Each structure stands twice: as C-alpha cells, then as structure tokens.
Amino acid sequence: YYSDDGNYYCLRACVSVPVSVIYDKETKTHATLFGSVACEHISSTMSQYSRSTRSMLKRRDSTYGPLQTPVGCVLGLVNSSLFVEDCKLPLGQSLCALP
Amino acid sequence: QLHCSYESFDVESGVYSVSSFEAKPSGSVVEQAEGVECDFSPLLSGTPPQVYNFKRLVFTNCNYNLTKLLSLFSVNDFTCSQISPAAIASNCYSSLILDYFSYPLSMKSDLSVSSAGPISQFNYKQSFSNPTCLILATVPHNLTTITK
Amino acid sequence: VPGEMRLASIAFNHPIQVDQLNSSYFKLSIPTNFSFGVTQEYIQTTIQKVTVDCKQYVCNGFQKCEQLLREYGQFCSKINQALHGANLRQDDSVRNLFASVKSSQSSPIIPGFGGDFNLTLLEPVARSAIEDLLFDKVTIADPGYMQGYDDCMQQGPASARDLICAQYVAGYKVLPPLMDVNMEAAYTSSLLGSIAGVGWTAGLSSFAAIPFAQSIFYRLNGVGITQQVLSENQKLIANKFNQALGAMQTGFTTTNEAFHKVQDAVNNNAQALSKLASELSNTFGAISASIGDIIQRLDPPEQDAQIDRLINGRLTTLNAFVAQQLVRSESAALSAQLAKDKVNECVKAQSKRSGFCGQGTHIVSFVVNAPNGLYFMHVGYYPSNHIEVVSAYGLCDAANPTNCIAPVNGYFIKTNNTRIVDEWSYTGSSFYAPEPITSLNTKYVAPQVTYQNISTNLPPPLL
Amino acid sequence: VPGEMRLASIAFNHPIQVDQLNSSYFKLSIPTNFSFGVTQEYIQTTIQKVTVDCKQYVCNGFQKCEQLLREYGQFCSKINQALHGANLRQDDSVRNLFASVKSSQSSPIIPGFGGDFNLTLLEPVARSAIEDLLFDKVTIADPGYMQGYDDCMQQGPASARDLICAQYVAGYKVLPPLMDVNMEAAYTSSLLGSIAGVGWTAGLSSFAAIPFAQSIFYRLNGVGITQQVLSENQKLIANKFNQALGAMQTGFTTTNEAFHKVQDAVNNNAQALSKLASELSNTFGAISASIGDIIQRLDPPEQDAQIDRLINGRLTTLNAFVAQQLVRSESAALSAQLAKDKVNECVKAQSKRSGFCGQGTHIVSFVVNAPNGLYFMHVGYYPSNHIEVVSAYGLCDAANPTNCIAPVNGYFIKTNNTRIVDEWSYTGSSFYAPEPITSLNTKYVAPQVTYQNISTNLPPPLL
Secondary structure (H helix, E strand, O other): OEOOOOOEOOOOOOOOEEEEEEEEOOOOEEEEEOOOOOOOOOOOOOOOOOOOOOHHHHHHHOOOOOEOOOOOOEEOOOEEEEEEOOOOOOOEOOEEEEO | OHHHHOOOOOOOOEEEEEEEEOOOOOOOOOOOOOOOOOOOHHHHOEOOOOHHHOEEEEEOOOOOOHHHHHHHOEEEEEEEEOOOHHHHHHOOOOOEEEEEOOOOHHHHHHOOOOOOOHHHHHHOOOOOOOOEEEEEEEOOOOOOOEOO | OOOOOEEEEEOOOOOEEOOOOOOOEEEEEEOOEEEEEEEEEEEEOOOOOEEEOOOOOOOOOOHHHHHHHHHHHHHHHHHHHHHHHHHHHHHHHHHHHHHHHOOOOOOOOOOOOOOOOOOOOOOOOOOOHHHHHHHHHOOOOOOOOOOHHHHOOOOOOOOOOOHHHHHHHHOEEEOOOOOOHHHHHHHHHHHHOOOOOOOOOOOOOOOOOOOHHHHHHHHHHOOOOOHHHHHHOHHHHHHHHHHHHHHHHHOOOOOOHHHHHHHHHHHHHHHHHHHHHHHOOOOOOOOOOOHHHHHHHOOHHHHHHHHHHHHHHHHHHHHHHHHHHHHHHHHHHHHHHHHHHHHHHHHOOOOOOOOOOOOOOOOOEEEEEEOOEEEEEEEEEEEEOOEEEEEEOOEEEOOEEEEEEEEOOEEEEEOOOOOOOOOEEEEEOOOOOOEOOOHHHEEEOOOOOOOEEEOOOOOOOOO | OOOOOOOOOOOOOOOOOOOOOOOOEEEEEEOOEEEEEEEEEEEEOOOOOEEEOOOOOOOOOOHHHHHHHHHHHHHHHHHHHHHHHHHHHHHHHHHHHHHHHOOOEEOOOOOOOOOOOOOOOOOOOOOOHHHHHHHHHOOOOOOOOOOHHHHOOOOOOOOOOOHHHHHHHHOEEEOOOOOOHHHHHHHHHHHHOOOOOOOOOOOOOOEOOOOHHHHHHHHHHOOOOOHHHHHHOHHHHHHHHHHHHHHHHOOOOOOOHHHHHHHHHHHHHHHHHHHHHHHHHOOOOOOOOOHHHHHHHOOHHHHHHHHHHHHHHHHHHHHHHHHHHHHHHHHHHHHHHHHHHHHHHHHOOOOOOOOOOOOOOOOOEEEEEEOOEEEEEEEEEEEEOOEEEEEEOOEEEOOOOOOEEEEOOEEEEEOOOOOOOOOEEEEEOOOOOOEOOOHHHEEEEOOOOOOEEEOOOOOOOOO
16 A cells, blocks of 8 residues: 555555364374464464463463474474374374374 | 364364464554644734624534634633533534634623623624534734734 | 373384495395285275155155146256166176176185185185174164165164165165175175186186195295295295284274275265255255245245245255266276276286285285175285395306306305305295205306306206 | 468378288388487376365454354364365375385485486485476475465565465465475485396395396396397497486476476466455455455445355355365375376386387386376387398298297398308397397297298207
C-alpha cells in the first residue's frame, strides 16, 4: 500500500506456525515439532494460540529449553548424539527420534 | 485431538500433523481522509451583528470541535433545550448551524427560548423542533481582530 | 515415568572397504561363513467381489421412490454393468494364474518328504499348517455363504457383529471366489511336487523326480560353492537350514511387513463396505435419513422434494463407489501379473538376477495361499566373516607363453593352507575353500600380460 | 523475415539389406568401426510430501466457522488420515530402495580413480559436479526448514515470490524428505565403488577389487571382441569413451528428453500446490470468498448461509485433491520398483537383455541423484561401417567325416587378410577382425552336411 504520508509500505499478511507431534505409544509419551519456525519465536507458553493448553508437553518440558534441529525447533527431544539405523519415528533428513 | 480424529483411546505410534498456531493480532491501523473541517472562522473578526441582525452559518458533511471553538471566549452562559450542553458538542448530526451576535451580559436574563424578555419576543427565537442552544460569552483581550 | 525421547542421528553403515590395487595381482574379498535365512512377501491378486442392488440402496420399495427413481433408472443400469464387468475381471485373473500353476507332472507327497529337512509347510493330511497360522492371525470377520442369511437372523448368537449380516440390510451381495479353497490346496501341493527340480536343462519337458537334498546340492554348486565343501558339511547345511525354517514361527507379528500387508488387504475390503453402510444414515439435507419417516410426516407436493434430495445423494455415493472399485480392480490385475511372474521365475527356477526373490543370491522359494493373494517366502544365503586374500588374474607356463589358464567359477589365490604343496590354490567364489588347481576347475584362455609366469609345476597343462 | 512453412514427407530409414543365400555358405554383415555413445533416463521415485491444516484451509478461525465447521469435522479426519497413509508409503519406498542400493563391500574412491578414463562423475571431496549441474538447471523454488520460517517472515526482501513460503499462510506444510542429501550421495558413492567385479560368476559375495579399465576389457570380451584387438587399441578405446563421456556436458538441454522429464516432475509438485492456492479466492456463489468480508457485510442469519456455501465448495476441492495425490503416490511407488530392478541389473551388472538401456548392447551404466528420483545414464556400443563377408556354418575334415567343429563367439569367414596363409579365418561377433583359427576359438560339434568339406589343413583337430 501507498500511504498518504508519501511512503510505500507493503504487506505480507501473516503466517502461522505448522505443528506436528511425536507419539510413542509403547511408553505412552510424546514430544513436539514446531516446523521450520526456529526457537527464536518459541516460548514456554503460547500467546497465540492453537489450543487451550500446552500442559501435556510441560509434564516433562517445564524443566527444559527448546532445541533447534535441522528441520526446526522442537520440545523435549534431548540431544543424545546417538547413531541408530531406524528409530521407527524418523523426522526426515538425518534426524531421528529414539523411543 | 488425535484421539478424537482416530475415534480411539489408543492411537498407533508415529508422527502426526496437528493444527497450526493462529499467530496473533495487534493494535489496529486505519487510514482515511482527514481535515475536512467545519467552517467557524468568520466569528473571529469584524463587529458581530446586533441580536436582531444575527448571522448564520450552516454546516454539513464536515469535521468539528466545538469545545475548541468555545475556548476562544469566556463562557458566561452555556445552556440548551432538549439536549445537554455537553452532549450537543459530542453528538454527530446531519447538520450543525451557528448563529452569532453581539450581546451585553446585562441582558442575559432575557435570553432563553422560554424568556419573558424583549429579546425572545422580537429579536431572536429558536425552533422547538430541533435541539437548540444559547451561549453567552465574552471576547478575550487577545482577539484583536474582533471589534464592537 | 519414562524418559524423554532422544534425538539421534540416523546411522549409515559403511561397506567393507577393499583397496583397489595396481599391477598383476589384487586383493579379493571372500566370506568365511554363511547363514541360511528367509524373507517373505505378499502379493495381492484379488479384490473381494461385490454387487449392489440399485433399488434397495436408495429405498426399500416405498412407492414414491419407486416411481421417482424411474427417471434415474438408466444410471442404475450403468452401475450394475460396471460392477459386473469388474467382477468378471477378477475371475479372469484367477484362471490365468492357475494356467501357469499347473504342471504336466509332479511327485506324490508323503510324510518325510524332503528327507532330513523339516518341511513343516507340508499339509496335515488339509490346508497346510502354515496357511492356517496365517488365517488365525488375520482379524477378518467370519465368512458368508453357509449359513449366510441365517447368520444375520435371530437363529444364531446375539453377539455377532459381522458386516455379512449387514449385507442383507444394505442390499450388498458378496460373491464367492471362483478358486475354491480345496482346489486351491491341490494347486499348492502340485507346486510342491515340481520341486527337485529346477536344474537338469530347462525342466519344461522332462521331470527329474529326485530327492530334495540332491537338488539343493545342485543349487549350491550353481553359486560357486565347491562340491567338496558341500560333502563335508551336509549335516551343517541341514542344521542351518532348519534353524531358518524354525524362525517362521516368529513371522506373524506387526513388524513383519508382509504380514502387515495381508492384514491391510482385509482391512481395505471391509472398509469399502462399511462406507456404503454409513451413508444409508446420512441425510442429504432431507428432514430425515428414513424415507418412510419423511413420507409419513409430509404433504406429498413437498414430500418428494425431500425424497429427491435423498435420492440424489444416494446416487452420488454409488458413483464414487463404483469408481473406487474399478481402480482397485485394475491395480489388482497388475499385482496378479507380478505374482504370476514370480511363480514362473522365483519358484520354478533358480535365479542369478538378484532383484527378484529374497536378497541372498537365490535358492529355492515357496508359495502358499493367503486371503486375496499369494504369500511367498524365500530361502536365501547370507555371507559372513569376510577376509581379504591375494589373487591372480590367471596363470601361464613360463616355458611356453601360449599355455595360459584361468579358473572356472572361482579364483586363483595364493595358498595359505598346509595341505597344499603348490604355491597357488583354487577357491569357490561363494565361500572360502582353497583346493589344488586341477583341470576340472580351469579353462584355457588367450594369453595376457597380467597372467603369472609360472616357472615350476602345473598339472593343468602338465607341460 | 521468414518464408513459408514447408510440407514434407516423413523420411523412412531403410535397414541395410543383406542377401539371403542358397546352399552351405552365406554373407555376414559385420561392422568395421564403432563408437561409444550414451543415453540417459529419468525415473521419478517420489512425490513431494505434504499435509494441510483442515481448519486453516477452510477458515481463519472466525467464530462462525468455528461453530459451523463442526458438522463436517469427520471429513477432515478422513482427509488427514488419507494423507498420512500416503506419506508413509513414500517413506517405505525410500527405505526399500536403499536396502537394495547398499553393498556389503566397495572400493575406496580416490582422485585419479579409473585410470586413463576421465570419470568426471567423481566427487569434489560431496555431491558430484554433474549432480550439481542438474541442480543448477532445475528452476525449483528454494527449500524451507532452515532458515525456513524466517525467510517467509517479513525479515527478508520485499520482493520474495516463493510459493514455498506462502504455504505458511494457507496452512500447507511441506514435509522434509526422508533422507539427507549427503547420505543420498553416500549411497551413490558406494555404487561407484561397487563396480569391479561386474562378472566373475554372478559376483554375489566375492569382490574382485580390480581397476576400472580391466573391468571394461572384461565386458568387451563379453561381446566377443578378441583380446588381441583390445590390446592394440587400448588408448583409442579410452579416447573414444572419453569423448562420449564429454558429451554429457551438453546433455543438460531442453532437447534431452530425460532432462525434460525432470523439469516436468518439478512442476507436477508445483502444480498441485498452486491448484489449492488458486481455490482460496474462489467464491462458490458466496457474497465474497473472504469470511471477514461477509461478516462485515451481512446480518448473522444471512451470513451463516453464505458461510456454509463457502465451506462446502472448499471441502470439495480438498476431497478432489486427496484423490489426485493418492494416484500420484501410487505411480511413484510403481516407478520406484522399476528403478530398483535397473539398479539390480543394469547398474550392478552387464546385461544381455537388449531392451533396457541404450540400444547398443550393454556395457556399464551409472546412476546419480536427481530431484524426485534417480537419473541414469548408459554407456553403449554403436556399430559402424558395415561390410558383408563370405561365411560358413562350420569347417571340418573330409578326411575325418565324424570330426567337425564350430566357431565360438564369432564366425568362420573366408580370409581376406594377407598375413593368414589359411584359406579361412576367425573373427569376433562384435567387430570385424580376422584371426587364425585356433582351438581356443572352436568347439567340437556333431557333423553336418552344410559344414564345408575340408581336404587340406586344419590345426583344430590337427588330425
């Protein structure tokens, strides 16, 4: 838009943060991925928001910071730096998610 | 949500897609034409008319601030009929009309739409079909373009 | 309480490196151990065959429907014709498959077939016990046909929850397979009777009629294992083979992908039927999903507005349904062709191609009946404990350069064995097995600069 | 300026005619020259993997939609589950493909690998430069993940136009590929090291670990070229081979059909995403395609009717979209199977099939990574300068009528060469080159009336 103050400004509308979760049925536990968003925009609680709670993540993640990955920022993933052939929960890339 | 989507209390393991964050709203930003401005500058110069010779300005489609307009005089009478004097300044209307004339404060007892005085009898009257007001005020020493 | 999930790198296994080497000799990698093992596959060949009554799916003969539907009656005719043609294709593929399954001749089969090998796949004379293990682990609803209609009806348990009873509500019909499970069992035993074997020329005329163990020995010479090793290890071979055979009892888990595929073939058939059933209760903006209900409650000028909303939606789901069936039927036909190809290659012959069959060279494979398809399993050879040895491209007489030889199905390696006085030794290509070089293991070749110049003794040629 | 278009007949290339002949001898057509050349193929193996938020595509969380969409919430589950299963199949095909790609052992890769052959496919130790030439030719929008969202977000140029960052507005998500491209490159590095052995039996477990040049000569003796010819022309052969390899630098053009297929695969994925995006503005007869517009323009009883109309059309496009993706994912799986077979035949070994690969017999082929698939290239052998020569079914003694012979991988020809005193000569099937007839080039056969009756001198048998 051209504003009537003589400056062009322009509009990107807004974007949403894609989300997915890891579900480990055998232990009945979970962890999450915020897509490509990066942990600069991630916080312990959400001001946006997609759902009324984040507390199921907080059951273990109240004590931990967000972690960056090659796909993007995640919660509760723990950097173990292990090398495993197939986690059955792969995140794509070289990323993996051990039970 | 996943349990509901699979209508089960035991969903198979794996990675699943869930709804995205809506992000969030902020303070609004609005642009629209400004400054149209309801005329009101003729009142500040020359000699005002005798009350029977009062001068009128009709205003439509325009922007105003009567409380700013009235800070140009000391007001010794601020009254109205069928509208509070405060409300007429803040209320929007299809039109705004102003009459002005010189008027001594000594005659203020005679200025009402209901007054028994000769001013209401022969000099100036206002309709009861519209909200109306009457103002008495005097000129500041810094309005040198006003004459008497 | 369980620990947090752990981030990890995906491992990448590295191949054993073997250095390339210049000059007239080179490093050679050879396994020193092996194990038998198995793989499995499921190839679907059919789609369950169904038909749909095109009157009943829309309404129950209520007469407002009966008259209104006449305007759309040609669509039902198209629906019925399309479904009919789809079912014909399913039966065509069955006959075509069986034409390759049959053999002009086969061995009789008795208990103790296959000699010392366990062969638990043999029938309990009956469908094989292995086929029954598959059928028991499958979660499929109890079958129609007999008693069929009276298993819907109150003359049976109150706990039945079969879609087969819903067949008589929805107007569905499930057609019986053409193949007949008893005739099918005869076909699978006929295939077992063609074993022993694949060798001895093409095998497309003559029938060898020999014991299974002998055909195995033939196959192992076919992959470069020396005959001498095979004779020394005959009991070892049977033990390793039966260890792999015993592992089949752990083959019915959700981690076995072939097993998982069998279960999803069943799930897909049941799912399609359930979709049509659920749509009978789906209002199409009609006041109710029941036709008799809207007839009872409405003045006839408005009554059929509601009826037509319902009719149009019922027809729409049928159109989508037919299209879904046609696509599945065509994919099944192609899948059936693949199964036929494996029967005419992976089963009827030993193969050197890799690719097809389990990945361990190839040795005999077997096939059994599975619902809507065939289930294959493959015996295979897995190398282990690889070592590097010195080897030469060939050997020649230093006294006469035109006398040059090279190994047949094997390699010439420097000897590391105390039994052999000769500096070089022949080995099998699939196993480490040094042996003296003899004329049986070599052939004359044109001379080449990289061949060794041997200044002493060769028995092949003597001079 | 250009002239008029020209109508023309399609040319018909006539095959070289070769005369059939009467009696015991015949003409033979054989090339006297050849050139290496290449062909290439592209096989798509994957579909881009995507998911979509089933509420965000439909609405922006406006409260009336939040209430109205609930009636259709079960459709969203059907949509998501179908997409989820489709993405699982994509991952399965990758894991299966890689299981066949890996080898138990391989050569290390070094600079200068392959000797006199140029081997420009070698890694810049990496992905090969040839793979990067392909990636530069590809017009695809830049990938997300990292930095991802911050390159979507307003901290970037105001001129970005990528559809990849528009996904975030629409709620689309592009899933990352199952495997990191460096691991994918590592898999193809192991394939380069899997060359040699190629033959040497089936090659299934042993690894010859010999120079690339030697494996080429082995393959050339696989088509009957004599070793004598090969030894004379070794530098020439590598030079012709390298020129054929050098043509790959011009191979990345729009007239190359394999290249064109890669470009189409890129825009098949783009087409799918753009289709859904265009529908976001598509009113369905609703007063506006925007929900917020109808909220501001309509009283809520009116507003909700327009919202339902808008929702219904939006759901329909999602349903159609899923069906199309299911079709595409299936074709990708089938194509992956085709690629697997070529890896297990045409890459891992020389093949006698004809058919697959370039039409010039077969010699070694290579594969590299490509977007959405594998890119193959095939070295092939092209005959030239064909001549016809006199030839015979066999030659054997009239003095020893029960003793006959026939040529091996070649044909007996009347000699036209001044160095051979013998009236007959032997040449290889793939290339004209006369040679003395020797026992290495013959085999004993039963006698036949069409064999020439030789009254003079043959060394095989001497007597």
